[PDB]
Amino acid sequence: ITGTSTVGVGRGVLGDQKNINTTYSTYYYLQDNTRGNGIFTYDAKYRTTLPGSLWADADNQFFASYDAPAVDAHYYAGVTYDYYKNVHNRLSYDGNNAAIRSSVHYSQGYNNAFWNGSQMVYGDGDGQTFIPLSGGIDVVAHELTHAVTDYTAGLIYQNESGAINEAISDIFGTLVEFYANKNPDWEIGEDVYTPGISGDSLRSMSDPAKYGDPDHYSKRYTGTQDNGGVHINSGIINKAAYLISQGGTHYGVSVVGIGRDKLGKIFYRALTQYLTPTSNFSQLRAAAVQSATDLYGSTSQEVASVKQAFDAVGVK
Ligand SMILES: [Ca+2]
Numbered sequence: 001i002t003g004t005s006t007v008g009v010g011r012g013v014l015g016d017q018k019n020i021n022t023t024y025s026t027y028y029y030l031q032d033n034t035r036g037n038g039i040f041t042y043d044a045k046y047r048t049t050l051p052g053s054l055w056a057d058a059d060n061q062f063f064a065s066y067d068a069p070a071v072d073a074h075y076y077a078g079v080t081y082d083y084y085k086n087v088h089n090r091l092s093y094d095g096n097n098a099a100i101r102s103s104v105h106y107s108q109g110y111n112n113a114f115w116n117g118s119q120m121v122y123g124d125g126d127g128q129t130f131i132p133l134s135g136g137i138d139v140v141a142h143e144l145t146h147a148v149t150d151y152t153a154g155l156i157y158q159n160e161s162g163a164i165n166e167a168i169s170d171i172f173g174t175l176v177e178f179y180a181n182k183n184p185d186w187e188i189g190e191d192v193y194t195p196g197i198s199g200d201s202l203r204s205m206s207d208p209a210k211y212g213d214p215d216h217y218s219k220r221y222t223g224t225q226d227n228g229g230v231h232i233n234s235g236i237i238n239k240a241a242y243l244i245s246q247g248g249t250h251y252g253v254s255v256v257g258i259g260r261d262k263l264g265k266i267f268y269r270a271l272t273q274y275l276t277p278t279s280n281f282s283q284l285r286a287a288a289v290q291s292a293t294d295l296y297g298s299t300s301q302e303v304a305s306v307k308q309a310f311d312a313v314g315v316k
């Protein structure tokens with residue numbers, strides 16, 4: 001809508017207070033005009049019809065419990081936009097400041113979130129397995145990263161290329177979590193998963209096998225579930241990325257860590273410059289080595305650590 005930019009205040013899913021960019025025109029709308037062509041948050045009103053109604057509020061205060069998922073979807077979309085702009089010089093997901101749209105309150109008791117090809121969508125969860133999914137910044141950044149991947153490499157959502165697609169979203173979801181820097185970790189979804197059980201998460205990058213996911217190529221899933229295991233075999237790549245950053249010895253192979261910032265730079269370059277829709281794990285390794293070479297030289301520690309990380313997980 002057309003109106004006056006302003007700043008409102010609200011409470012997110014976890015009860016934390018934050019400021020949000022809104023637009024005023026009779027009502028106050030969740031429309032942030034300060035980032036590219038805008039960030040827009042919609043109410044799907046417990047239906048599956050999308051996008052729903054652009055979120056309108058009478059007083060620019062968002063403290064009602066119904067408000068919380070919208071506050072967080074709106075605010076964390078902004079953080080993610082800032083991460084891509086400030087760190088990788090990328091303007092929104094298409095690189096040309098496309099408007100970012102999110103809908104919340106999708107369906108009833110819906111235990112997931114997703115990018116549908118044009119916007120992000122967030123369920124409220126059933127209160128048992130999940131609380132509203134926009135409450136996790138790693139979850140928001142994961143979904144928005146699918147949009148980035150679709151506009152760049154275009155990795156098909158099947159088999160190895162699909163597992164790479166998933167790992168990239170987990171990797172950048174985590175890097176964005178570290179960017180915002182409130183209790184960052186190498187786990188996925190811990191803020192919104194199983195409110196009744198502390199210390200768990202949906203996936204682990206530091207130790208995928210904790211939840212039964214493979215951490216070595218020899219343990220890859222070869223069946224047909226989950227589109228050929230796109231959320232399962234991602235653990236192999238997530239472990240590689242964790243090792244490149246933090247270091248460690250894994251199946252007897254030692255890796256010198258080079259830290260998060262270099263991990264992000266290498267993987268972003270691989271994504272945007274070298275990966276293609278049908279890239280497999282071996283092609284990821286080659287793309288990552290070539291990226292690190294481009295940035296730091298063929299005889300760098302950086303190139304060395306990428307090679308050892310991929311050897312450690314069994315990807316040749
Ligand atoms: Ca209000």
Ligand SMILES: [Ca+2]
Binds near residue numbers: 191
């Ligand atoms: Ca965390």
Ligand SMILES: [Ca+2]
Binds near residue numbers: 138189
């Ligand atoms: Ca996390």
Ligand SMILES: [Ca+2]
Binds near residue numbers: 190193194196199
């Ligand atoms: Ca939990």
Ligand SMILES: [Zn+2]
Binds near residue numbers: 142146166169
């Ligand atoms: Zn995903």
